[PDB]
């Protein structure tokens, strides 16, 4: 209405504004952030690592990596074989496979990772060997 300038949300924080000259309504949303996790086999076995960015889509990760992002501990994404999209977040540095095994390093919603020349693979965990007793 012609007499409000600021705005608020279901809490007490400004999330809109009116430009003093070009009298237009503008939204406000903050820039992305979240946790970071490192997935590694023991230093006794191997020395490679994989990285998980929690709660983002992979395109916003790739764009920011091409322009600007904190934690400059950058990994190399060779092809689509590196970037992978889980429910938890983008998984950079692991190749998704087609088989099923036991869970070794739990990651997210049914996804587990393991060290199988050698590299790091992420798959879908298996609940056990199928069986059917002959009633």
């Amino acid at each position: 209405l012609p007499f409000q300038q600021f705005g608020r949300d279901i809490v007490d924080t400004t999330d809109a504004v009116r430009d003093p000259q070009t009298l237009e309504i503008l939204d406000i949303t903050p820039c992305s952030f979240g946790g970071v996790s490192v997935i590694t086999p023991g230093t006794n076995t191997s020395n490679q690592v994989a990285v998980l960015y929690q709660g983002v889509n992979c395109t916003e990760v790739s764009v920011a990596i091409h322009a600007d992002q904190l934690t400059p501990t950058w990994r190399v994404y060779s092809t689509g074989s590196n970037v992978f999209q889980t429910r938890a977040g983008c998984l950079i540095g692991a190749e998704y496979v087609n088989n099923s095994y036991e869970c070794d390093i739990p990651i997210g919603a049914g996804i587990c990772a393991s060290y199988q020349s050698q590299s790091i693979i992420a798959y879908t965990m298996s609940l056990g060997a199928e069986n059917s007793v002959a009633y």
């Binding site: 809490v11 929690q54 609940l127 002959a134 009633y135």
Partner: protein
């Protein structure tokens, strides 16, 4: 009255539910984004308080990790995923409501769907659970299909096979009722069972307040978060609740006084939230242990504990998944239609007391009989079902009769 007894003549099959919470939501809280934000001065001041955040991070990590040991302990009771045969005939017992339905996409049972439809920034995120809801379903289906075609055998070694009516005969024999009672009523009991399951469905349609226990486990989270994210708009005795405004109106040497009050208030709020979470997690684990025990002793075997796996003598149970918990369907045995008789604890004959093998002596007014203790079935007295053990001049209440051969 000191010489009269009552013995039932007709039974009943009933099904009663029971709901238990198992796990709660996983959360992770980041200090510097909550307390401070992007301001460097706030973090440089927060470094003077020691390690008040590593402890919080460790405690919440411990709670989150524990939340997945609660589900791995209730459902992961088996190492094989059993199936059910294509021919869905089990002597007349009808399991269509509990077994999975392949037509729908998520492969849940109708009761499971009904259950699923009845239950509803600043560094405050939620982690997803490890086991998706389409895996809990597979565990539940394997548990259900191992107890139909094997009985209790699959919980103590290799799963051995046996037809269903023979299993139910075993389970009647396990509560003091002979086998034949089932075989002469096999149809009736089957129908007696089939309707009970149906009632369950309606008992969850009309009543909305059935699943409060799970619902609370959800509600108690939201409040606990809401309050936290509201506590960010309190001055705590300072001049404003926004760090940027203070940093844009006061000389930095004069601003530590204002920033300190905010820092202390926010630390206090975080500590309160963490402690409440710790206590609630303790309660949830206490419940999950009982859920695991009930899975082990009512589903994988028949229980002799009173009022543990249902009200009445116990027959079996069936698990069904649910959001953040589990639901059990206990199948019990309730006597009915009692009839009165006159009794006495011995039968004198040829100067020898006579006591039954198992059963109680019963009179119908003129004749004497010995019958089992839970379902009226009289028999002609005979030395085959009595033992002598003593003389006739000691026992009290003994009634003299004849015993054939």
């Amino acid at each position: 009255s000191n010489n009269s007894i009552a013995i039932p003549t007709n039974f009943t099959i009933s099904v009663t539910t029971e709901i238990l919470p198992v796990s709660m939501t996983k959360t992770s809280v980041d200090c510097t984004m909550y307390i401070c934000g992007d301001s460097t001065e706030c973090s440089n001041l927060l470094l003077q308080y020691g390690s008040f955040c590593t402890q919080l991070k460790r405690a919440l990590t411990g709670i989150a990790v524990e939340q997945d040991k609660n589900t791995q302990e209730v459902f992961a009771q088996v190492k094989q995923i059993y199936k059910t045969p294509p021919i869905k005939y089990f002597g007349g017992f009808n399991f269509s409501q509990i077994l999975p339905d392949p037509s729908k996409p998520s492969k849940r049972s109708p009761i499971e769907d009904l259950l699923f439809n009845k239950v509803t920034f600043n560094g405050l995120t939620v982690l997803p659970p490890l086991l998706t809801d389409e895996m809990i379903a597979q565990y539940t289906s394997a548990l259900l299909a191992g107890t139909i075609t094997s009985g209790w055998t699959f919980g103590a070694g290799p799963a051995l096979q046996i037809p269903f009516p023979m299993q139910m005969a075993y389970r009647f024999n396990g509560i003091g009722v002979t086998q034949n009672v089932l075989y002469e009523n096999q149809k009736l009991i089957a129908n007696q069972f089939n309707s009970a399951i149906g009632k369950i469905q309606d008992s969850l349609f009309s009543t909305p307040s059935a699943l409060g226990k799970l619902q609370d486990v959800v509600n108690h989270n939201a409040q606990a978060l809401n309050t936290l994210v509201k506590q960010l708009s309190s001055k705590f005795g300072a001049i404003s609740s926004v760090l940027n405004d203070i940093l844009s109106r006061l000389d930095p040497p004069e601003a530590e006084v204002q920033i300190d009050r905010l820092i202390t208030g926010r630390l206090q709020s975080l500590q309160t939230y963490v402690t409440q979470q710790l206590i609630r997690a303790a309660e949830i684990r206490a419940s999950a242990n009982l859920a695991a025990t009930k899975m082990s002793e009512c589903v994988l075997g028949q229980s002799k504990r009173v009022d543990f796996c249902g009200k009445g003598y116990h027959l079996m149970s069936f698990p069904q998944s649910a959001p953040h918990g589990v639901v059990f369907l206990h199948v019990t045995y309730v006597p009915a239609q009692e009839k009165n008789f006159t009794t006495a604890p011995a039968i004198c004959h040829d100067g020898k007391a006579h006591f039954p093998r198992e059963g109680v002596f019963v009179s119908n007014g003129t004749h004497w009989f010995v019958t089992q203790r839970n379902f009226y079935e009289p028999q002609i007295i005979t030395t085959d079902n009595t033992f002598v053990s003593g003389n006739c001049d000691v026992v009290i209440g003994i009634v003299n009769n004849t015993v054939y051969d």
